[PDB]
C-alpha cells in the first residue's frame, strides 16, 4: 500500500524558518515525483512545487520563491520543504503528494500543520459563562465556558467529566495575537441547573494544566 | 495562473439525490501531450484530499461508478448518481496542464434538513476575567439551518467590529445543524464605559434579526 507519512506539527516564531519532511513507502520511490500543496483558512489549496527524487530538479510556483525550498534524500525516501522568514500568512496545513508520469497528484500525506506565533507555552484562562437573567420555567438553559490566552493547541473541554454530551458545542480555536481562544456551550433543562451542578472541565497538556470551573448563577 | 471557478459553493442534498458540480477555467486545459489534465478531489472533515476523478472522466481506483466526470476545453462537470452519506465533504477541481497547478475554491456537499432557527445566548464578562483586566462578551448561535448566518455586535446602539472573533462548527452528525460562537473582547475600562451590549443574528428563519442583549447595570 502507498503510504505518505509527514512530520508532526510545528510551532515557529515569526521570522524564523522550519523544515518539514515526508517519508514515502509502498512503491518504487524513484519512479515518481513528489509535490507540495498549501491549505490555509477557508481551505484554499495552493500548489507549491514539484521535485524529482533522482536529480533534485524542481518546478516551483513563482509565488513561493522567497518562501519554500524543496530537497530530497532518496536513500531515506524522504522529501523536505523549508519555509523561511515565517509570518502569520504562513500559518497553514502543508500536504505531501505523489506525482506519477501522468502529472496527476494521486496519493496525499496526512498533512503537517505549521503555526506561526511569538508565544511560548502559555496556560489557559478559563471563565464561566452564566446567563445574565433567570431562566424561564420548563425551558432549556444554555451555559458556556471561555478558554482564552493559551498556546499551543490542543485544549480539551468536557462537561461534568463527560456525563453531559448532548447539547455540547465546543468550537474550533482561533489564533489571535499569538494566543488561542476557544469557547464551549452546553444546554440543559432549567430543572437541572442551577439545582444541580454543571462544571466545565478544561485540559491543556502542553502546560500540564487541568481546571474545573463550576457554572454558578449570577445574582 | 489558470483560474478555477466552481459552482456552486454550497450544494445541499438529500441522500439519494443526484449532484452536479461545475468547474469553469480561464483557458483550455489541453496539454501538449494531448491529455486534458483536469481532476476532481474530495476532502472529508479532518482528512486529506483524495483523488476521485482524473483527466476529466477517469475514475481512480476504488472510486464507485456512482461518480462520473465530463467536459472539455473550459467547462467541466462532476456528477453523482445517488449521493451517499460517505460522499459528503468538499470537492475541489484542479488542473495540472500549466504551471503553477491551481485548484478550485471548493464545493461543500452538505446534508439537507428542515429549517431551524438559531438558539441565541449572550453572556456578560465573568468576575474572574474582570479582575484580571479583561472583558469578553460571548454570544452562541447554536443548532441552525441553513448554514448561512451573519452576526453583528452593537455597543449602545453603535456597530462594533474590532475585537470580534468568530468560530463555526461543521454540520452536526446527529441533527445536521450548524453552530456559531462570537466573542467580543474589550478592555475592562472600555467595558465599564458602556452599558448595553447586543448580539444580532441575521438568518433565513427570521425576517428581522434575532437580538439577544443585556445591560451591564
Amino acid at each position: 500500500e502507498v503510504q505518505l507519512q509527514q512530520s508532526g506539527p510545528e510551532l515557529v516564531k515569526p521570522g524564523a524558518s522550519v523544515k518539514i519532511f515526508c517519508k514515502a513507502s509502498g512503491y518504487t520511490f524513484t519512479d515518481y515525483n513528489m509535490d507540495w500543496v498549501k491549505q490555509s483558512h477557508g481551505k484554499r489549496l495552493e500548489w507549491i512545487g514539484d521535485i524529482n527524487p533522482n536529480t533534485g530538479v524542481t518546478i516551483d510556483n513563482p509565488k513561493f520563491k522567497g518562501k519554500a525550498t524543496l530537497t530530497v534524500d532518496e536513500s531515506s525516501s524522504t522529501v523536505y520543504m523549508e519555509l523561511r522568514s515565517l509570518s502569520s500568512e504562513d500559518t497553514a496545513v502543508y500536504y505531501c503528494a505523489r506525482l506519477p508520469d501522468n502529472y496527476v497528484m494521486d496519493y496525499w500525506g496526512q498533512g503537517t500543520s505549521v503555526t506561526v506565533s511569538a508565544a511560548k507555552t502559555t496556560p489557559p484562562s478559563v471563565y464561566p459563562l452564566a446567563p445574565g437573567s433567570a431562566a424561564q420555567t420548563n425551558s432549556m438553559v444554555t451555559l458556556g465556558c471561555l478558554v482564552k490566552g493559551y498556546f499551543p493547541e490542543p485544549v480539551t473541554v468536557t462537561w461534568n467529566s463527560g456525563s453531559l454530551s448532548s447539547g455540547v458545542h465546543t468550537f474550533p480555536a482561533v489564533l489571535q495575537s499569538d494566543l488561542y481562544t476557544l469557547s464551549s456551550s452546553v444546554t440543559v433543562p432549567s430543572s437541572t441547573w442551577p439545582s444541580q451542578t454543571v462544571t466545565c472541565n478544561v485540559a491543556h497538556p502542553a502546560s500540564s494544566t487541568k481546571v474545573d470551573k463550576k457554572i454558578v448563577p449570577r445574582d | 495562473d489558470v483560474v478555477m471557478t466552481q459552482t456552486p459553493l454550497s450544494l445541499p442534498v438529500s441522500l439519494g439525490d443526484q449532484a452536479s458540480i461545475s468547474c469553469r477555467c480561464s483557458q483550455s486545459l489541453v496539454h501538449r501531450n494531448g491529455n486534458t489534465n483536469l481532476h476532481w478531489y474530495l476532502q472529508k472533515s479532518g482528512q486529506s484530499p483524495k483523488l476521485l476523478i482524473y483527466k476529466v472522466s477517469n475514475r481512480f481506483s476504488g472510486v464507485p461508478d456512482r461518480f462520473s466526470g465530463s467536459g472539455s476545453g473550459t467547462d467541466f462537470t462532476l456528477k453523482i448518481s445517488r449521493v451517499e452519506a460517505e460522499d459528503l465533504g468538499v470537492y475541489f477541481c484542479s488542473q495540472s496542464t500549466y504551471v503553477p497547478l491551481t485548484f478550485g475554491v471548493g464545493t461543500k456537499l452538505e446534508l439537507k434538513r428542515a429549517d431551524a432557527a438559531p438558539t441565541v445566548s449572550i453572556f456578560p464578562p465573568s468576575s474572574e476575567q474582570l479582575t484580571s483586566g479583561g472583558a469578553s462578551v460571548v454570544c452562541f448561535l447554536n443548532n441552525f439551518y441553513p448554514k448561512d448566518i451573519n452576526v453583528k455586535w452593537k455597543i449602545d446602539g453603535s456597530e462594533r467590529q474590532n475585537g470580534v472573533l468568530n468560530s463555526w462548527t461543521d454540520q452536526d452528525s446527529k441533527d445536521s445543524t450548524y453552530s456559531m460562537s462570537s466573542t467580543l473582547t474589550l478592555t475592562k475600562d472600555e467595558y465599564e464605559r458602556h452599558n448595553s451590549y447586543t448580539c444580532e443574528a441575521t438568518h433565513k428563519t427570521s425576517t428581522s434579526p434575532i437580538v439577544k442583549s443585556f445591560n451591564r447595570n
Binding site: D31, N33, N52, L99 | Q27, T97, Y98
Partner: peptide
C-alpha cells in the same frame, strides 16, 4: 506566459 507542467519524472 503559459508554460506546460511537464517535469522529467522517472528513473
Amino acid at each position: 506566459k503559459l508554460v506546460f507542467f511537464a517535469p522529467d519524472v522517472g528513473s
